[PDB]
Design a protein around this nucleic acid. Structure first.
Ligand SMILES: [Ca+2]
Ligand SMILES: [Ca+2]
Length: 311
DNA sequence: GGTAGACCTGGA
DNA sequence: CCAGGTCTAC
């Protein structure tokens, strides 16, 4: 009982709750949907993972979000739950965002009704950078497996629940270390093992370390996007993922073949400027402008919602 | 200078 | 053998 992953109904004295309606958030729609890859539904409706350098389990009812942290056991403190608030960017009201997109997009109107609770996670820049560098020519199941082994290999050991040992995401110096590539290739990352290693070294040995990456949150989206592309293994898509998911740039719209199919089938979209009939540097850039023009400042979040509905 | 092909490797 | 992302040879 005092062992393994906890459940709201088996260790109540250790569960604090954050007032949150299921319309404002649906863990089952945001946690395993390709944003973060370190969340596991260890037990039904219960999600465990590393947040703010600690292991947590989250489960929700209808008006509450129940949280328990694994650091002397005791329910989460005020400051701790506040961290969870920040991670789920709760001050950002979805009821308001859905109303807006819906009123300017009749297609979002219908489709979005059945998929409330989809928001964007405010992740850490490094985790995003390397997680998303691994996303190349890949899928969520495979990315998750890769990222899981990468953290098992180079991440600080946090704690152990049942037969699961949690690790923090690797630091920059860890990934920049000698022979990390050879080691990551043994973990099946393929050519992605090269980009991880190079970007780790590039940031530390050319860009001015961690702080460089951080400062991008205070930079403009167009400025932050251009910065990230410098890094080896980081293209336009990954740059937009990092901008949208870790650099507080909600108007960033990562364009990929998926978004393309949603554009042609749901909006009869066609490229205007670019002469390429299909995806290309020009056309994808154009597609991104289309949705930012369509949904506005949060075109990135709108996309998330549409991607889920398309699942 | 916009556009094929390789990069890893698991499915085709 | 080649994606579906990035990087590079014409
Ligand atoms: Ca690049
Ligand atoms: Ca339609």
């Amino acid at each position: 009982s005092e062992f393994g992953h906890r459940t709201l109904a088996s260790t109540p004295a250790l569960w604090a709750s954050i007032p949150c309606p299921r319309s404002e958030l649906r863990l089952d729609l945001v946690l395993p949907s390709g944003q973060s890859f370190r969340w596991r539904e260890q037990s039904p409706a219960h999600w465990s993972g590393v947040l703010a350098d600690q292991v947590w389990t989250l489960t929700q009812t209808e008006e509450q979000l129940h949280c328990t942290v694994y650091r002397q056991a005791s329910r989460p403190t005020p400051d701790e739950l506040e961290a969870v608030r920040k991670y789920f960017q709760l001050d950002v009201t979805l009821a308001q965002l859905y109303h807006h997109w819906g009123s300017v997009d009749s297609h979002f109107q219908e489709v979005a009704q059945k998929f409330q609770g989809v928001r964007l996670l405010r992740q850490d820049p490094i985790e995003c950078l390397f997680s998303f560098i691994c996303s190349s020519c890949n899928n969520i199941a495979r990315i998750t497996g890769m990222v899981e082994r990468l953290c098992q290999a180079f991440g600080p050991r946090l704690i152990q629940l049942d037969d699961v040992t949690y690790h923090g995401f690797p630091s920059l110096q860890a990934l920049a270390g000698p022979e990390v590539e050879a080691h990551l290739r043994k973990l099946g990352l393929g050519y992605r093992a090269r980009y991880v290693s190079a970007s780790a070294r590039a940031i530390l040995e050319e860009q001015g370390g961690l702080a460089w990456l951080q400062q991008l949150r205070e930079s403009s989206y167009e400025e932050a996007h251009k910065a990230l592309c410098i890094l080896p293994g980081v293209g336009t898509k990954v740059a937009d993922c990092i901008c949208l998911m870790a650099l507080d740039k909600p108007q960033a719209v990562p364009v990929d073949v998926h978004m393309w199919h949603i554009a042609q089938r749901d909006y009869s979209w066609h490229p205007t400027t670019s002469q390429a009939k299909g995806p290309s540097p020009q056309t994808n850039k154009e597609l991104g402008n289309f949705f930012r023009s369509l949904w506005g400042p949060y075109a990135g979040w709108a996309q998330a919602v549409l991607f889920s509905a398309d699942l």
